[PDB]
Design a protein around this ligand. Structure first.
Ligand SMILES: CCCCCCCCCCCCCCCCCC(=O)OC[C@H](CO[C@@H]1O[C@H](CO[C@H]2O[C@H](CO)[C@H](O)[C@H](O)[C@H]2O)[C@H](O)[C@H](O)[C@H]1O)OC(=O)CCCCCCCCCCCCCCCCC
Ligand SMILES: CCCCCCCCCCCCCCCCCC(=O)OC[C@H](CO[C@@H]1O[C@H](CO[C@H]2O[C@H](CO)[C@H](O)[C@H](O)[C@H]2O)[C@H](O)[C@H](O)[C@H]1O)OC(=O)CCCCCCCCCCCCCCCCC
Ligand code: CLA
Ligand code: CLA
Ligand code: CLA
Ligand code: CLA
Ligand SMILES: CCCCCCCCCCCCCCCCCC(=O)OC[C@H](CO[C@@H]1O[C@H](CO)[C@H](O)[C@H](O)[C@H]1O)OC(=O)CCCCCCCCCCCCCCCCC
Ligand SMILES: CC1=C(/C=C/C(C)=C/C=C/C(C)=C/C=C/C=C(C)/C=C/C=C(C)/C=C/C2=C(C)CCCC2(C)C)C(C)(C)CCC1
Ligand SMILES: CC1=C(/C=C/C(C)=C/C=C/C(C)=C/C=C/C=C(C)/C=C/C=C(C)/C=C/C2=C(C)CCCC2(C)C)C(C)(C)CCC1
Ligand SMILES: CC1=C(/C=C/C(C)=C/C=C/C(C)=C/C=C/C=C(C)/C=C/C=C(C)/C=C/C2=C(C)CCCC2(C)C)C(C)(C)CCC1
Ligand SMILES: CCCCCCCCCCCCO[C@@H]1O[C@H](CO)[C@@H](O[C@H]2O[C@H](CO)[C@@H](O)[C@H](O)[C@H]2O)[C@H](O)[C@H]1O
Ligand SMILES: CCCCCCCCCCCCO[C@@H]1O[C@H](CO)[C@@H](O[C@H]2O[C@H](CO)[C@@H](O)[C@H](O)[C@H]2O)[C@H](O)[C@H]1O
Ligand SMILES: [Ca+2]
Ligand SMILES: [Cl-]
Ligand SMILES: [Cl-]
Lengths: 334, 35, 450, 34, 341, 135, 78
């Protein structure tokens, strides 16, 4: 009726090709801003003094990077955790030199992904669905927040956020392992179980459904054409799949309830990723992985090495080389 | 009612559980070794 | 109410959902759980007292509750030396006994007390849709919360004071005689940017501000309590909110997630409400301490630390912040917003002052910097102190690390719980939390997207 | 080695206990299956 | 009835643990591999092969025990208990790392037996054998990593040790010496694994949140029956949701589940190809253009070059302890390191 | 090998003196070291000033030499600069200043003797003792 | 749905199972215990005791170097 009411019905409309919604009213601008700035910076940003030592790092394609080595470089260590929008730079060149694009892209991206999760809830509400797809999506959101915001907060600088690049990601991981022994952190082990097991369960579920497909096609056409979109009947024989799997391992380890099976499929990777996100978020406060360096002594008192000691040697090798000009004092506390 | 006692399932159970309990006893004892 | 799946519709693993409409049983669950909280407070306090070596610093002994009591001004003197161990014991004993009482009451209500309270009393009986009654319970609890804030104020002002790490002559328990009631300061804290150098409310740095803000909080809470006792929700609130038990739970979950995140940040950064005397240095404090320690050492060796340039060309010991302030050099440049009682005496209007650095450094500052540098909040999960590549002989993890990590994790999972319950409350209010109705599946009546 | 004897004797004792408490039914089952 | 048919009947009886013909290979080999790992991690040292304690008996824990690879002196000898090295001496066989090939070979034949079991049970119950095809991925990983990589290298010593920290050591070794993260085949493996986890999560959640109202309980789990003919969740609603949220959506259930098979399996196969490359030191170690520019331009710095520096540090600091048979003596002054660290 | 008497045998004073810790003396010295010294002496280093480590060469280079147990106990009573010119009783923990070092006020002369003996024995069990901070 | 075997819950809730197993299970437990605590495991598997990692003549890691005569190599390592 009223103009505002009409606008409300448009934004919350389920007939839009892309659902907008109220969370979308924030998601779309912030995500577009982040995407445009990211593309521009990745192509053409000038080098960024990430470590705050006047040692600029070239991240963009036009300054000699390929796709693998290119990145949007985290803002300068001199900035620390200070807010550095464009309007606090003396010029655009200064803003670029100090890594302002990283802050712009990251802040907009984070707002965008939280609004994406809210938008998932919103559309589920408009369509009469159950509301918990956004809960599953909260796992990747938690991980991204850990690596882009929480870890820089705990470490005290956005220069210690994950770079927006492939090789930058690897650098982040290697330094992280050198400083926190993330491999020996049980939450990262749970994350590995989450992703290995999620892939395992994806492979099993897909293979068991594909294995039990009901015959509806000929040997020529794709078996995919045996399923018609919106058909009421089941397209595979879950009882045959259960018979096969319960004989592969044993009867009582096999799901015969599709609903319990799909809940398990949702829950395993999501929980694993929640745990690994919390692992990164707590290593942000330097509660690190297990330290068994020199845990085994012989009777005299000489250290007997274990694989943990070899791992520590690798960590030290990474530790002494990283950011080779940035440290003045013996302990890497910052 | 009145099932067999020993089966393939019995053997599968014991083949695992028996050395498992033995090994657990060994590791428990290791918990008290002094250097 | 039923106690199984057929008669409730809830499995055992969601069994507490069976309590949603059994107000007496729900009250019992809450009271017993409160008993659990108070029991942990008392038992952990007694454990910490028993495992307390009172001449060693609190933060060296894995203590998280005793620092809370010490900050309140009980059992400590200047620099945080533990004078009397008895008050800690008393706090623990009182919590333990009261937990016994609370557990007795929670068990009574959960097991034998009336199932529902509405046909027993209008005052205690409630319906989730009864907006006036829900706001009444809000009002009562707001009055209580304001009273607790005023209890903090009364302890700081009339009952021996609180520990002030910024006290002249050394950090000491002191009585706060002039809390800042000026609403400009108090509520301008809420407007400060949550970024480096501003620190939205984490930057509160003097007990006068803390006590004055608590006076304001007490007044706000009590007045809001009265306001909610005497009114009902307005039309806009009624049209905007879901009015159900699970909805109220989800609202509280969101609030708790926010508070958990805030507390983790607060303990990580703030050294006023969390004095380093009891909680150890912040990470920023330890980094700055290392820079100071080597400035002092090298200066004693004869280095002219004002003019010594490092390998990159920046000053090794001193440099400028991006706004020009004189700050410690090295990686600790990121931590130049740090303020601490041991370092501010060497700070001039422009930042670190060369004259003070060259002739005003006291031996106690050197000792404090060495201690803070060597107790940096870095440690392994199995409590091996120092950087992760260090060897096993230093058993230390900062209490700040424990508190910050734990409460960030709890904040995150309570955000997850808020999402879960908010979505469920919406779906249940709209009536599709049990799945899509085949007859009236909404998408079947929608135009195709393309 | 005496260590062998004392490490084996518990295993043997478990064997005889199980035998003396299951043997009637075990021989019943063995005979039934021929 | 011939004796072969009688045996076939007995092997394929419906019992709690199906045996089958494949069981003749699977169960003894799998039991050997598992018991060998358990025995080695509980009792067996790596003192003579690696100079490391690797068993509970020596004081190591779950994270630090391993069946360590054999000594580098043996090259790729299969290290049979009766072989020329151990010569039938069980104690010596344990001490030289004979348990590692024991576990690796018995595990390889156990994996073969398990996939043959997948084929056999699929054939018996009358379904398509796509589970075995999916299992080919883990087999490719095991073959490449535990056999082909050490076979291309100097010896079994450089195979991953069967242990948690042993695997971590192998991972960091491959980063520092091979720059394995830079390898495009590894990146396709990572894409496949993370995509498989994503598909698992998103499919499970989508199904659970588009369920039909088929019962009256808040507990939606018992509104399903395995013999029911109709779909338990709304594919149409799921498709509309994902089309409006993400832009695109599955509309074919069969393609969806084949994709859930396809993604992680292809990831495993691509990563195995990359590992085969690393077996011959055919690495994606460097970008020569950036190396040359950095060598002539001391102001050119990228994340790639920083990672190269990290690898150099790891190699120099790790090699003397990781490769004790080499007797690497790197004096303190030759170790690379940044300032103050 | 065992933690033999020779391993526990350490120089007692500068005039060639020699003492042997008992296993209990060594274990209490280790316990005290881990409790109060490892703070800035992990693995025989000195986190706050690694020019002056606990390595045998640094200990023997001090004035007077501190690689014997009496010199170590004396330093722990009255700490001095490495050339024995500056009084560090305000700057290094010592039993003589319980007012500023309370972490040490409960230690006996036997305890200081034990920790000094451990400081002399630990270097021969660990080649990394007294090395570089990252080493 | 039972493949023929007795259900586990029935077996493990029965008195006879527990009369058997309150003996069998502890005996294997203390058999493994005695395996460790008598020193049998050290000698059987060749694992060094805490005082035998190094000898009064070998202070270095006894890394095997010879391709075929490891028995003599280990003996000279002691
Ligand atoms: C609904 C509402 C949504 C609201 C959105 C608005 C934005 C929220 C997030 C803000 C992001 C801040 C980034 C930088 C944080 C920072 O600079 O630092 C943290 C700041 C504190 O700021 C610090 O405050 C400090 C105050 O200490 C100062 O004062 C002290 C006094 O004792 C000491 O003296 C100390 O030495 C001295 O430096 C200093 O000023 C520091 O420089 C300053 O950085 O926290 C703060 O202000 C605010 C508290 C932050 C909470 C932590 C984030 C929670 C994230 C959860 C993600 C979950 C996701 C789940 C998904 C699924
Ligand atoms: C699909 C998978 C299904 C699953 C299957 C699972 C079951 C697998 C069963 C197979 C077991 C394979 C054992 C491999 C033994 C081996 O290779 O052992 C190696 C030996 C050769 O011995 C090696 O030889 C090398 C070179 O020696 C030569 O050169 C030296 C230096 O000059 C000396 O002069 C020396 O005298 C001379 O012989 C070195 O000496 C090594 O130390 C030594 O180990 O080959 C040999 O026995 C035989 C060589 C021919 C057959 C090789 C088949 C395997 C090929 C693997 C790929 C190889 C390379 C690519 C890598 C990727
Ligand atoms: C004050 C906070 C609060 C309250 C009152 C509730 C209340 C409720 N929740 Mg809920 N929830 C919360 C927070 C809360 N939740 C948070 C923070 C999360 C995110 C994880 C959730 C996620 C959640 C889900 C997914 C569900 C509920 C459900 C429910 C209802 C029934 C739950 C039940 O019976 O418990 C049963 C208790 C158990 C089954 C035991 C769980 C043990 C957990 C998983 C591990 C504990 C770890 C802990 C840290 C200790 C570590 C132990 C270690 C030593 C090994 C109930 C009304 C159900 C519902 O929706 O009802 C309609 C339901 O499906 N909640
Ligand atoms: C803080 C944790 C907590 C609390 C306070 C409650 C409370 C409650 N639950 Mg519950 N629940 C929980 C966790 C909790 N639950 C978890 C983790 C699960 C998953 C396993 C469940 C699953 C569950 C189900 C399936 C059901 C409940 C139900 C109930 C209610 C009825 C209790 C009852 O009759 O059982 C009786 C139990 C007993 C009589 C055993 C003894 C219990 C007492 C209290 C033990 C106290 C011992 C203590 C040390 C003694 C000190 C006494 C004094 C001297 C201090 C009740 C209010 C029921 C309900 O909803 O009612 C409608 C219901 O059906 N819960
Ligand atoms: C928030 C917690 C809480 C709430 C809302 C209730 C509510 C109720 N209780 Mg319960 N109870 C509790 C905790 C609670 N109880 C605890 C911890 C115990 C163990 C001691 C009990 C033991 C108990 C028994 C045995 C009985 C009840 C009964 C009742 C019902 C009647 C109340 C009444 O009119 O009596 C009168 C109320 C008063 C005379 C007011 C007295 C207020 C207290 C006792 C004085 C202290 C006030 C204090 C200063 C305020 C702050 C508290 C402080 C700790 C911060 C009512 C629904 C009765 C019932 O169910 O009827 C059949 C019943 O028989 N309760
Ligand atoms: C736990 C304590 C508590 C709780 C649960 C409530 C709950 C409620 N109050 Mg409230 N209130 C309280 C304390 C509390 N109050 C106190 C202490 C006071 C005294 C100051 C008041 C004074 C008050 C008034 C005047 C009114 C309420 C009203 C309400 C009802 C609806 C308001 C609403 O939607 O909230 C949410 C708020 C909004 C939807 C407005 C948006 C606010 C901004 C835009 C959100 C941005 C927050 C930001 C992200 C956080 C940054 C922190 C800081 C920097 C600002 C609701 C049931 C309304 C009512 O119906 O009265 C009967 C109402 O008119 N209260
Ligand atoms: C139910 C409610 C139960 C108890 C309510 C609390 C009662 C606290 C009363 C004790 C106050 C001290 C009296 C003697 C004294 O003056 O101080 C003696 C000492 C030291 O306190 C000193 O008091 C002096 C008074 O002039 C000065 O102010 C000094 O500066 C001050 O240090 O206080 C103590 O040792 C007692 C510790 C106080 C802790 C009590 C708070 C927690 C109590 C209960 C929590 C229960 C929660 C259940 C839920
Ligand atoms: C409901 C329910 C539940 C819950 C319950 C609860 C939650 C509870 C509780 C409870 C409680 C919460 C309790 C308590 C208690 C306490 C006590 C009982 C005490 C005491 C005391 C004492 C005795 C002390 C003593 C001492 C002293 C005096 C000092 C010195 C030291 C000592 C310690 C000795 C459940 C889940 C189970 C389930 C069922 C239902
Ligand atoms: C004590 C203290 C202080 C003080 C403080 C204060 C005074 C405070 C406060 C505070 C406050 C006073 C607050 C608040 C808050 C708010 C919130 C948190 C909100 C919100 C919101 C919401 C939640 C909403 C929602 C919604 C929307 C969005 C729309 C639609 C509807 C709804 C409802 C859904 C100081 C710092 C000075 C000092 C220290 C201590
Ligand atoms: C070597 C060898 C062999 C083989 C052997 C065998 C085959 C055996 C075995 C064995 C075995 C087969 C053993 C076992 C074991 C075990 C164990 C050691 C266990 C364990 C466990 C645990 C520790 C668990 C725990 C838990 C968890 C964690 C979860 C839940 C709860 C429970 C408790 C379950 C022969 C002589 C032929 C030849 C030569 C070489
Ligand atoms: C599916 C197939 C599985 C294959 C593996 C199954 C287990 C196979 C184990 C075979 C073990 C071979 O073990 C080998 O036995 C021979 C014969 O006794 C021993 O030989 C020993 O006795 C013989 C005669 O009695 C002497 O000539 C010889 O000098 C002496 O060493 C070897 O020292 C031992 O190494
Ligand atoms: C769970 C199973 C645990 C594994 C087994 C645990 C027991 C370990 C067995 C060690 C037994 C004695 O171990 C010692 O080495 C082997 C055992 O093969 C024997 O070795 C001897 O016999 C073999 C076999 O013919 C020949 O190579 C040769 O004659 C000689 O080496 C030694 O004479 C024995 O002293
Ligand atoms: Ca100390
Ligand atoms: Cl780096
Ligand atoms: Cl530095």
């Amino acid at each position: 009726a009223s103009l505002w009411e009409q606008f409300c019905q448009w934004v919350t409309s389920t007939n839009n090709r892309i659902y907008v919604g109220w969370f979308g009213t924030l998601m779309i601008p912030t995500l577009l801003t982040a995407t445009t700035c990211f593309i521009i910076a990745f192509i053409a940003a000038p080098p960024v003094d990430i470590d705050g030592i006047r040692e600029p790092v070239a991240g963009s394609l036009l300054y000699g990077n390929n796709i693998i080595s290119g990145a949007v470089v985290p803002s300068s260590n001199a900035i620390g955790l200070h807010f550095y929008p464009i309007w606090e730079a003396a010029s655009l060149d200064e803003w670029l030199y100090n890594g302002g694009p990283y802050q712009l892209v990251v802040f907009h991206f984070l707002i965008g992904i939280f609004c994406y999760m809210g938008r998932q809830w919103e559309l589920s509400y408009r369509l009469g669905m159950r509301p918990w797809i956004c809960v599953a999506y909260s796992a990747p959101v938690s991980a991204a927040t850990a690596v882009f915001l929480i870890y820089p907060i705990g470490q005290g600088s956005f220069s210690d956020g994950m770079p927006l690049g492939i090789s930058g990601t690897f650098n982040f991981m290697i330094v992280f392992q050198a400083e926190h022994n993330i491999l020996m952190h049980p939450f990262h082990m749970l994350g590995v179980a989450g992703v290995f097991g999620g892939s395992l369960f994806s492979a099993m579920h897909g293979s068991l459904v594909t294995s039990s497909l009901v015959r509806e096609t000929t040997e020529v056409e794709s078996q995919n054409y045996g399923y018609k979109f919106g058909q009421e009947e089941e397209t595979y024989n879950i009882v045959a799949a259960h018979g096969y799997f319960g004989r592969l391992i044993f009867q009582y380890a096999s799901f015969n309830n599709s609903r319990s099976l799909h809940f398990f499929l949702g829950a395993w990777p999501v929980i694993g990723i929640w745990f690994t996100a919390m692992g990164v978020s707590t290593m942000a406060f330097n509660l690190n992985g297990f330290n068994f360096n020199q845990s085994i002594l012989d009777s005299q008192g000489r250290v007997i090495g274990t694989w943990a000691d070899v791992l520590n040697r690798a960590n030290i090798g990474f530790e002494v080389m990283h950011e080779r000009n940035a440290h003045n004092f013996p302990l890497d506390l910052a | 009612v009145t099932y067999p006692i020993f089966t393939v399932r019995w053997l599968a159970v014991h083949t695992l559980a028996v050395p498992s309990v033995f090994f657990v006893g060994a590791i428990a004892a290791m918990q008290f070794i002094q250097r | 109410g039923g106690r199984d799946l057929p008669s409730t519709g809830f499995a055992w693993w969601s069994g507490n959902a069976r309590l949603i409409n059994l107000s007496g049983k729900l009250l019992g669950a809450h009271v017993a759980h409160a008993g659990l909280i108070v029991f942990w407070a008392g038992a952990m306090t007694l454990f910490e007292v028993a495992h307390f070596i009172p001449e060693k610093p609190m933060y060296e002994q894995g203590l998280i509750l005793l620092p809370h009591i010490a900050t309140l001004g009980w059992g400590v003197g200047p620099a945080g030396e533990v004078t009397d161990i008895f008050p800690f014991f008393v706090v623990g004993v009182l919590h333990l006994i009261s937990s016994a009482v609370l557990g007795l009451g929670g068990i009574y209500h959960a097991l034998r007390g009336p199932e529902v309270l509405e046909e027993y009393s209008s005052f205690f009986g409630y319906d989730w849709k009864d907006k006036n009654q829900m706001t009444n319970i809000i009002g009562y609890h707001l009055i209580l919360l304001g009273c607790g804030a005023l209890l903090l104020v009364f302890k700081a002002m009339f009952f021996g004071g609180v520990y002030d790490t910024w006290a002249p002559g050394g950090g000491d328990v002191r009585v706060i005689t002039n809390p800042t009631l000026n609403p400009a300061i108090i509520f301008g804290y809420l407007l400060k940017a949550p970024f480096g150098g501003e620190g939205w409310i984490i930057s509160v740095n003097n007990m006068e501000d803390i006590i004055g803000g608590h006076i304001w909080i007490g007044l706000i809470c009590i007045s809001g309590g009265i306001w909610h006792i005497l009114t009902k929700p307005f039309g806009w609130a009624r049209r905007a909110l879901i009015w159900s038990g699970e909805a109220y739970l989800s609202y509280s979950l969101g609030a708790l997630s926010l508070m958990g995140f805030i507390a983790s940040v607060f303990v990580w950064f703030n050294n006023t409400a969390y004095p380093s005397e009891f909680y150890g240095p912040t990470g920023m404090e330890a980094s700055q301490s290392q820079a100071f320690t080597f400035l002092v050492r090298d200066q004693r060796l004869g280095a002219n630390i004002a003019s010594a340039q490092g390998p990159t060309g920046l000053g090794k010991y001193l440099m400028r912040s991006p706004s020009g302030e004189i700050i410690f050099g090295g990686e600790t440049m990121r931590f130049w917003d740090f303020r601490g009682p041991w370092l501010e005496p060497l700070r001039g209007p422009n930042g670190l002052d060369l004259d003070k650095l060259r002739n005003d450094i006291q031996p106690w500052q050197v000792r404090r910097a060495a201690e803070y540098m060597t107790h940096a909040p870095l440690g392994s999960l199995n409590s091996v102190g120092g950087v992760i590549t260090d060897v096993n002989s230093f058993n230390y993890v900062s209490p700040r690390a424990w508190l910050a990590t734990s409460h960030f994790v709890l904040g995150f999972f309570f955000l997850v719980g808020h999402l879960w319950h908010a979505g469920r409350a919406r779906a249940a209010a709209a009536g599709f939390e049990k799945g899509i109705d085949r007859e009236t599946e909404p998408t079947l009546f929608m135009p195709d997207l393309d | 080695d005496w260590r062998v004897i004392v490490v084996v004797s518990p295993l043997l004792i478990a064997a005889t206990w199980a035998a003396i408490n299951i043997g009637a039914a075990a021989i019943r089952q063995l005979q039934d299956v021929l | 009835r011939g004796w072969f048919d009688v045996l076939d009947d007995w092997l394929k009886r419906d019992r709690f643990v199906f045996i089958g013909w494949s069981g003749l290979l699977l169960f003894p080999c799998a039991f050997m591999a598992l018991g060998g790992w358990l025995t080695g991690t509980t009792f067996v040292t790596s003192w003579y092969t690696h100079g490391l304690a690797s068993s509970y008996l020596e004081g190591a824990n779950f994270l630090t025990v391993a069946v360590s690879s054999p000594a580098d002196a043996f090259g790729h000898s299969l290290l049979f208990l009766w072989g020329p090295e151990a010569q039938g001496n069980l104690t010596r066989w344990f001490q030289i790392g004979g348990l590692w090939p024991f576990v690796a070979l018995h595990g390889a034949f156990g994996l073969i037996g398990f996939m043959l079991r997948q084929f056999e049970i699929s054939r018996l119950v009358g379904i398509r054998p796509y589970n075995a095809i999916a299992f080919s991925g883990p087999i490719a990983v095991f073959v490449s990593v535990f056999l082909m990589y050490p076979l291309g290298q100097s010896s079994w010593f450089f195979a991953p040790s069967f242990g948690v920290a042993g695997i971590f050591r192998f991972i960091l070794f491959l980063q520092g010496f091979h720059n394995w993260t830079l390898n495009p085949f590894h990146m396709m493996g990572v894409a496949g694994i993370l995509g498989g986890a994503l598909l698992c999560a998103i499919h499970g959640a989508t199904v659970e949140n588009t369920l039909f109202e088929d019962g009256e309980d808040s507990n939606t789990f018992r509104a399903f029956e395995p013999t029911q003919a109709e779909e338990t969740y709304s594919m149409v609603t799921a498709n509309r949701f994902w089309s409006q949220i993400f832009g695109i959506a599955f509309s074919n259930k069969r393609w969806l589940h084949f994709f859930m098979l396809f993604v992680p399996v292809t990831g495993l196969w691509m990563s195995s190809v990359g590992i085969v490359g690393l077996a011959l030191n055919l690495r994606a170690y460097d970008f020569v253009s950036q190396e040359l520019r950095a060598a002539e331009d001391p102001e050119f710095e990228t994340f790639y070059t920083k990672n190269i520096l990290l690898n150099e540090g790891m190699r120099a600091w790790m090699a003397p302890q990781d490769q004790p048979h080499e007797n690497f003596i790197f004096p303190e002054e030759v170790l690379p390191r940044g300032n103050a660290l | 090998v065992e933690l033999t008497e020779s391993t526990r045998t350490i120089p007692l004073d500068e005039a060639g003196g020699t003492t042997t810790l008992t296993a209990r003396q060594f274990t209490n010295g280790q316990k005290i070291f881990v409790d109060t010294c490892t703070q800035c002496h992990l693995q025989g280093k000195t986190k706050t000033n690694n020019n002056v480590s606990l390595g045998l060469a640094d200990l023997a280079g001090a004035e007077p030499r501190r690689d014997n147990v009496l010199a170590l106990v004396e330093f722990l009573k009255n700490p001095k600069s490495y050339d024995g010119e500056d009084d560090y009783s305000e700057l290094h923990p010592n039993i003589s200043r319980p007012d500023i070092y309370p972490e040490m006020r409960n230690y006996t002369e036997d305890d200081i003797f034990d920790v000094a003996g451990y400081t002399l024995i630990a270097p021969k069990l660990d080649e990394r003792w007294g090395g570089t901070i990252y080493f | 749905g039972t493949t023929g075997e007795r259900p586990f819950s029935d077996i493990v809730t029965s008195i006879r199972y527990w009369v058997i197993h309150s003996i069998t299970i502890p005996m294997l437990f203390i058999a493994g215990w005695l395996f460790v605590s008598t020193g049998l495991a050290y000698d059987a598997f060749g694992t060094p005791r805490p005082d035998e990692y190094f000898t009064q003549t070998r202070q270095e890691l006894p890394i095997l170097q010879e391709r075929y005569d490891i028995n003599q190599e280990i003996q000279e390592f002691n």
